[PDB]
Design a protein around this ligand. Structure first.
Ligand SMILES: CC(=O)N[C@@H]1[C@@H](O)[C@H](O[C@@H]2O[C@H](CO[C@]3(C(=O)O)C[C@H](O)[C@@H](NC(C)=O)[C@H]([C@H](O)[C@H](O)CO)O3)[C@H](O)[C@H](O)[C@H]2O)[C@@H](CO)O[C@H]1O
Ligand SMILES: CC(=O)N[C@@H]1[C@@H](O)[C@H](O[C@@H]2O[C@H](CO[C@]3(C(=O)O)C[C@H](O)[C@@H](NC(C)=O)[C@H]([C@H](O)[C@H](O)CO)O3)[C@H](O)[C@H](O)[C@H]2O)[C@@H](CO)O[C@H]1O
Ligand SMILES: CC(=O)N[C@@H]1[C@@H](O)[C@H](O[C@@H]2O[C@H](CO[C@]3(C(=O)O)C[C@H](O)[C@@H](NC(C)=O)[C@H]([C@H](O)[C@H](O)CO)O3)[C@H](O)[C@H](O)[C@H]2O)[C@@H](CO)O[C@H]1O
Ligand SMILES: *[C@@H]1O[C@H](CO)[C@@H](O)[C@H](O)[C@H]1NC(C)=O
Ligand SMILES: *[C@@H]1O[C@H](CO)[C@@H](O)[C@H](O)[C@H]1NC(C)=O
Ligand SMILES: *[C@@H]1O[C@H](CO)[C@@H](O)[C@H](O)[C@H]1NC(C)=O
Ligand SMILES: *[C@@H]1O[C@H](CO)[C@@H](O)[C@H](O)[C@H]1NC(C)=O
Ligand SMILES: *[C@@H]1O[C@H](CO)[C@@H](O)[C@H](O)[C@H]1NC(C)=O
Ligand SMILES: *[C@@H]1O[C@H](CO)[C@@H](O)[C@H](O)[C@H]1NC(C)=O
Lengths: 317, 172, 172, 317, 172, 317
């Protein structure tokens, strides 16, 4: 008589790796490395702002393409390749530091800073910022001398942050095409903008000169920014070439910002994003994009790491 | 294997065994029969799904962007960032390969082990009334009709019942 | 366990055994008695404290401050720093969890193994004069007064002494 | 007859985790993650400098609260929230780089730089730096024109580092409240400070203008610094608004710097510090503070990781 | 060891055995002889060189310079860089020590295991015609000339051949 | 009778570490940590440029020691301690960012930018750049006023990158020893250099003043650079103290750069380099240099980690 012990097998096993062998056949296995993308931004349940043509820093200054974004509110901020921060050509100093502040801000809320002016004009415009006619940056003021060639009287303005979180403050310097044009806008002389607070110290002079035409303009606007702590004051001593802030920004809460070229999708949910979409997965690892942001499997170099979920397959000979 | 069974002194799986990982196959006098052992099968299944529950793990750490694929950040900070991200990719790639190779070695070994445990349980169950043939089978030196085989399977075989008969059938 | 003992074919610990990890419990004719096995106990104790000495490890690398909790460093370098520190926290948290889970699996298994080794040593010590009951006990088919049990314990039992008597008491 | 093999158990086991199970009960276990803080700075056996009200960068310039620190010597430097680097308002450029240099310096040793002056004053003072009366920065000189409104004669001064380690050099720029006041202090004209060495190149102009009053002052002092290599010379070409160095600093050795709000304790010893105290532990991991500095267990996210130090506990049924 | 052999109930290696890792040593009547077992030897050799092929691993990630030993980069970015490089050195130093300690524990254990497997194969091969002496030797209770020993070695010993003779020589 | 099972041993085993014991003796072992250096730069099969006395940034500007390097082509770029980027004293802004660009450039290819000039001189020279007589930077032009003290007519020049990869552009600012000398070179007045593109915005003024004599010179040249994107234009509005680019650089491909003081060796091959040589090894770890670059074993702190390649050695007693 007889009785035998044994285990199971299959004609179709899966090879895996171990510490001692490469390509051992086991009964069953399963993948640890996520390969599969969803080519959409899965936004189900999230307050989402798709900036489209508005660049993220434009939400603070207000070029026309950002008019519907001046006080946005979001958990998920999406930047687009077609976005632009400017209408009149220019750029921000420490722009990317500011982009990272605004990506996690939960949005911004604006507040009049209450600057009032005297013997100057305040309605500088351009055809690079068209709202119907020629216009400017919605949150800013292009300050001139009161009439062609006149003196700019060295003014000072102050703003006290009377709120319990820090104030984002932004101003600009206008670099005219020439010192002739700088003179027609603000009068003659080396013009100096001084900006100070309880922890800030900097100064700026204009740099007239001819530049690459951008948006049909050879002049440029420098944009600068600082964070006013609660109960602190910011002070602007200036005599020309000054693009002044009309409103300050306060941050609403917290959010996440991504960059993408794929469509929003409110039918799927996901916490791991990249420019090409959403990594929905429970696997511990992914091989889709090492710059994926959010809550993600760890990025690894390998496309596949099979984890044995069965015994060694020893086939019936 | 580490325990010399699931590719050792058994060295053949049964493609027929389609309702468990481990099974008894016997032939007495009423022909041959094959059954599963849900106890061992469930032990290996539970240990392995324990591994699975551990590794199909969802980290709660959010990471944000620190560079920019539309407007390249400044070159020196961008090279530090790239060098850091690449160093961490190296670390995680090593971790993931090692984790899976270690785990696979141990999965195969605990499957092997569950086999050895089951076999030993039956050997100890059959006491002096059987011999080890050396390929996974107990040569039983007394009559063992289907009922007796089921008593082996379901862990109720009483060695005292056949002890005299079987010992006598083994010696002379 | 991996070796089928410390929660296997023994499947009960002795709360009474308070002077070793592993022990002999016998009953002959002078009643029942219980003793420890310092050899196996010391082997498991030494292996486990070896693990402990390894992991209660003091790194000699000094790290310094690279940011500032009284005066925030500049935002871009501060975000790179925070992103780096968080990535390394992820790495070390994974390392520590995996290290402890692996180590615990192996500690339990080497304890189990020390049990199986001790049991096998006594089985081989008793030769043909005993049978395996299947629950951790050797049914000894000859008289074994307290002295004889102590000869089993302290590794001096001579199977030749009772071999004829015991074999005769086992067969017929 | 009979003899049985067995193992021990307890009514009171500890659950741990393994690769295959969560919450297995084992006979004994032990903690790998340090939770316990000591709310003091354990400084037993260490030369310790508690800066208190002196800010770390003030040790180089010498505002009154740093007078007992101008040549400190330490293995452990402690910064306090109440510290200030300044008396007359101002700040340093690349301040945090300098803080990290001074935290590991082992202290500083000062040396006269031997600048001597001609047709100028050298005793500028203020009420923001009071030592009895109005005073200034102990290591510096507030250089003026010899009398209200007079010319500042464009001077040059040089200092050669004749020592075998690099010299910390610090100077200042005075930003007056106005170009009127800048004129009363240093005369008229755009004033220019040039500073050069064998590996250094920079220049500075003052930025008069009205700022937030800080310490009762609307003017500001920029502080700048460089490291003179041994046998190199530093050169200062200047014509006003210049806060000149009187002494240079040399680094003593090596140290560690921490930031804390808890008291020094010379009864305990510790190599792992954070703002709230000392992590004395031999465990490999800690969950107290991810910014702990010194020689520390690794920071992990989990509060507990029990390491089995006994066999599986299978209780007597 | 985990399997109680290569430093367990054998507890002596043979410096004489210079042509394999594992071997048979017998003495019958024609004197004593010693041979290797290429099967087990090759199994341990192949598993261990499998480990070696895995770890003697060449990473394909290029890293570039991010600082400068002729002209020191700026101090703040240089401190971030140094702090990062040191954190990764900590991680890799831990990884390498743990990897080697784990691997060594498992190498020793799989060597031990191959011994236990071989021994068990011969025990099962000899059936009822031999006893376990307890030190690695099978006391064979029947004549076993050199040819018979070689039949044990090369896995052709037929227990039925000597079963009557040997059993009779064991009992009375 | 008898037959015994056993295993092998040796009188000479190697100690290793395990999880449970330190110094277990095993039959055989092998090293995982590379200790052995090759004190040469193993360059077999690689296009190698040893810069020697030419500093890497000098390949863009062309001081005499870089004349044989103005268009180099390489897979492996080697920097030497004796290298210098300059002849007339000066330095580059964001120098190390530029060094990292050029290390991986595969070399540079130059192209005339086609600036042509009017009422100025273009042949400024010095004795710090000797090619036979006094000369200058081969890729640049020292622009002066047409004769001692004359006006510099505020010019503009443009260059369009008509190529499909970005153009490296470099210019300089001459800081004269004094405003007297600045006047003799370029005339009087505050001179202003403006530089713009489609993503760039900056401005520069000279800073005359006396500096440490370097190469027998107390004046200095600032060097600055930017990357012109394909089809973009760079614009230079300037009125003096301007060191103008004559040629722009384009990057050839890709390479690796190292710093070393050991000799090139074309008899050995290696992918892992450091200042002292080549780490040829298949081991996973190395303890030679944590700043090793290329494709390397991972750096670890330990000098040795023996991996068991045999069973436990239990010797014949
Ligand atoms: C200060 C001034 O008027 N300068 C004259 C140039 O504007 C002018 O150049 C032409 O500018 C055209 C459009 O320019 C506007 C504009 O729409 O941007 C008209 C705006 O009202 C004016 N705004 C203000 C606050 O002064 C604005 C501004 O002057 C510049 O943008 C500042 O640099 O200019 C268009 O771009 C044409 O293509 C261009 O030729 C020239 C005449 O050519 O005369 C200048 O005196
Ligand atoms: C250059 C000058 O004298 N300017 C006059 C202002 O000082 C003055 O403003 C008042 O300043 C008061 C205290 O100022 C001192 C000071 O204690 O700091 C006096 C110091 O001797 C002087 N030091 C030097 C080297 O000149 C110092 C200095 O002028 C400024 O700090 C530089 O900005 O000022 C106090 O703050 C008062 O609250 C303030 O009104 C005004 C008069 O209001 O006249 C200015 O001409
Ligand atoms: C603008 C000028 O001519 N300035 C005079 C100084 O050059 C001169 O200082 C002496 O300079 C000596 C060498 O100077 C050269 C040179 O070889 O570098 C002559 C060059 O042709 C001239 N190049 C140009 C484009 O102008 C160059 C240049 O002036 C400076 O380098 C710019 O700062 O100078 C040598 O260094 C002597 O040691 C030094 O005394 C003084 C006379 O001492 O008069 C200045 O007017
Ligand atoms: C193989 O493993 C995966 C994951 O555990 C499981 O979903 C799948 O059903 C398994 N297949 C079989 C045939 O067991
Ligand atoms: C950093 O890496 C990205 C791709 O991961 C690359 O496109 C970018 O140019 C890199 N930054 C550099 C080389 O400065
Ligand atoms: C970095 O993290 C700290 C806390 O770890 C936080 O307080 C600080 O603001 C962070 N820096 C940022 C967000 O720039
Ligand atoms: C449990 O383990 C810890 C650490 O090894 C030890 O200090 C403690 O005394 C142990 N307790 C018992 C009852 O063994
Ligand atoms: C970074 O470390 C190197 C050595 O690895 C050292 O020479 C250098 O000075 C350090 N940078 C600092 C301290 O800023
Ligand atoms: C010991 O191991 C190394 C690496 O596997 C090998 O090259 C060497 O020949 C071995 N020595 C012996 C005696 O096996």
């Amino acid at each position: 008589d007889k009785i035998c012990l044994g285990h199971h097998a299959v004609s179709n096993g899966t090879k895996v790796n171990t510490l001692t062998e490469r390509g051992v056949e086991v009964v069953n296995a399963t993948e640890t490395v996520e390969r599969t993308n969803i080519p959409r931004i899965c936004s189900k349940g999230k307050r989402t702002v798709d900036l489209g043509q508005c660049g993220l820093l434009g939400t603070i200054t207000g070029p026309p393409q950002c008019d519907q974004f001046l006080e946005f509110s979001a958990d998920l901020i999406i930047e687009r390749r077609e976005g632009s921060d400017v209408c009149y050509p220019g750029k921000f100093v420490n722009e990317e530091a500011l982009r990272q502040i605004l990506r996690e801000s939960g949005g911004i809320d604006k507040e009049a800073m209450g600057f009032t002016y005297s013997g100057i004009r305040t309605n500088g415009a351009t055809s690079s910022c068209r709202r119907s006619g020629s216009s400017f940056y919605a949150e800013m003021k292009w300050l001139l001398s009161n009439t062609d060639n006149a003196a700019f009287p060295q003014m000072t303005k102050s703003y006290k942050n009377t709120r319990k979180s820090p104030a984002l403050i932004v101003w600009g310097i206008h670099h005219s095409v020439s010192t002739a044009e700088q003179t027609k806008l603000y009068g003659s002389g080396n013009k100096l903008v001084t900006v100070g607070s309880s922890n800030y110290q900097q100064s700026f002079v204009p740099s007239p000169g001819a530049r690459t035409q951008v948006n049909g303009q050879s002049g440029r606007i420098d944009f600068h920014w600082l964070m006013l702590n609660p109960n602190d004051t910011v002070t602007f001593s200036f005599n020309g070439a000054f693009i002044a802030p009309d409103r300050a920004s306060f941050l609403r809460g917290k959010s996440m910002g991504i960059q993408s070229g794929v469509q929003v999708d409110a039918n799927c949910e996901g916490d791991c994003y990249h420019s090409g979409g959403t990594i929905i997965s429970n696997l511990p690892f992914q091989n889709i994009d090492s710059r994926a942001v959010g809550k993600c499997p760890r990025y690894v170099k390998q496309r596949s790491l099979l984890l044995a979920t069965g015994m060694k397959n020893v086939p019936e000979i | 294997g580490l325990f010399g069974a699931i590719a050792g002194f058994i060295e053949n799986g049964w493609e027929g065994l389609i309702d468990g990982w481990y099974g008894f196959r016997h032939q007495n006098a009423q022909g041959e029969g094959t059954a599963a052992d849900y106890k061992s099968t469930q032990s290996a299944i539970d240990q392995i799904t324990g591994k699975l529950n551990r590794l199909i793990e969802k980290t709660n750490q959010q990471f944000e962007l620190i560079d920019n694929e539309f407007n390249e950040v400044e070159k020196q900070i961008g090279n530090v960032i790239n060098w850091t991200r690449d160093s961490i990719t190296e670390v995680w790639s090593y971790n993931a390969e090692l984790l899976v190779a270690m785990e696979n070695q141990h999965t195969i070994d605990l499957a092997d082990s569950e086999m050895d445990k089951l076999y030993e349980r039956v050997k100890r169950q059959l006491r002096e009334n059987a011999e080890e043939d050396g390929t996974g089978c107990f040569e039983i030196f007394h009559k063992c009709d289907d009922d007796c085989m089921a008593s082996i399977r379901n862990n109720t075989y009483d060695h005292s019942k056949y002890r005299e008969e079987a010992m006598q059938n083994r010696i002379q």
